[PDB]
């Protein structure tokens, strides 16, 4: 029953593989895991730890194959297993959902004219679980409930950036009408600029990503009108994953404070980004430092 915090995070699978193999502290990965440390230490604070996370991400052809392609879906099940993406099931604890809030939010979005797909069984891929591992580490069970909110960006068209920003505003409204007093987070996962396919793989656009971060904080309504062709041309064919940062963003009010921003190049094929935002009225103090840019090009 309140959205206190908005977090974004990249969900690159090689991150969950550095953890599995014990190399998360070598020279390549070390600076990445260190830029997440202020998030881990912030979130364990009493009052900062969420009861429920609404985790908005793109399924990467895991739960959904070519036969059923929903634009917007929500997981209303009690448990979700980590998907087998080719390497065996990721060895992390099962994600525990919240069926009463997940179903409240699904009924509310359809009343608000979003054509939702309700999922009561589905595996969660790296889109969902890698951010849990980066932010909560390697507990025996996740410290909170999680509601998985998969969004299509695989087959075109994906939902417009306008559609996405409006959706985060109706998610906020439904969490506020949920009658329990829960501390609720919206996370958006994915990004930032990258391209996984073709002779232009390797594409990184730090100008586009840093302006994206800027506008997302201070003028998301303008950023919401950016057409898909601009993401594609400028931030790579998989840069389109940044549309989900807009869903997180429209769940917070007009005025937010950024408590912490991490930006690193590279992490596997991508520019990795992670941020914590709070409604300005209730925000805590920003962290020190407040903005970290790492990697050899930075």
């Amino acid at each position: 029953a309140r959205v206190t915090t908005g977090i974004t995070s990249s969900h690159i699978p090689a991150l969950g593989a550095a953890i599995q193999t014990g190399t998360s502290d070598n020279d390549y990965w070390g600076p990445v895991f260190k830029g997440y440390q202020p998030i881990r230490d912030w979130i364990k604070q009493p009052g900062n730890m969420p009861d429920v996370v609404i985790l908005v991400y793109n399924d990467h052809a895991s739960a959904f194959d070519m036969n059923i392609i929903p634009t917007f879906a929500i997981g209303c099940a009690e448990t979700f297993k980590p998907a087998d993406e080719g390497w065996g099931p990721r060895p992390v604890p099962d994600v525990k959902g919240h069926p009463d809030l997940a179903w409240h939010i699904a009924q509310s979005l359809i009343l608000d004219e979003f054509d939702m797909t309700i999922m009561n069984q589905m595996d969660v891929d790296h889109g969902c679980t890698v951010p849990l591992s980066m932010i909560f580490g390697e507990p025996e069970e996740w410290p909170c409930k999680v509601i998985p909110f998969p969004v299509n960006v695989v087959t075109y068209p994906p939902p417009s950036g306008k559609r996405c920003f409006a959706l985060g505003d109706s998610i906020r409204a439904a969490v506020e009408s949920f009658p329990e007093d829960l501390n609720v987070h919206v996370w958006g996962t994915g990004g930032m600029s990258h391209q996984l396919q073709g002779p232009r793989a390797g594409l990184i656009n730090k100008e586009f990503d840093l302006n994206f971060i800027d506008k997302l904080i201070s003028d998301p309504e303008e950023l919401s009108k950016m057409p898909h062709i601009q993401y594609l041309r400028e931030s790579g064919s998989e840069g389109v994953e940044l549309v989900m940062w807009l869903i997180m963003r429209g769940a917070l009010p007009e005025k937010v404070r950024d408590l912490y921003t991490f930006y690193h190049i590279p992490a596997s094929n991508t520019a990795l980004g992670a941020m914590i935002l709070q409604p300005e009225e209730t925000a805590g103090t920003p962290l020190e430092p407040r903005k970290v840019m790492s990697g050899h090009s930075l």
Binding site: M66, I204, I229, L232, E234, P266, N269
Partner: protein
Amino acid sequence: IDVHAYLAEFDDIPGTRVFTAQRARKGYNLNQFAMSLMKAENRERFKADESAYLDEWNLTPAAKAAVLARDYNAMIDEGGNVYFLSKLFSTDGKSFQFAAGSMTGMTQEEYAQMMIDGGRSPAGVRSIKGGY
């Protein structure tokens, strides 16, 4: 508003094939093949004899040859999508960085160094007709 104009701008992007409807219908059998490798029983049967496994999916000859040669660029040309295809290179024990670098014609070492240095610049690969 105009679907046709919305799809046509995707053609001006260099070195990139956007997963539009027309590609999805073309790659349907090839992407559902790749999906079957999420199940370990299918992975192990496929690795025991690729060509017999592939013959149960009804691929075009160009698609099957693309699989057997592990040519990700040819697989995308036949309607393959990188996220369904990621099941195949994971079956082989390869990373997404490997796969992505194998589509650029750089060696693995150069592609890894390029990323370390900041990744490929957008300069010159935004628009086929503009040249920028």
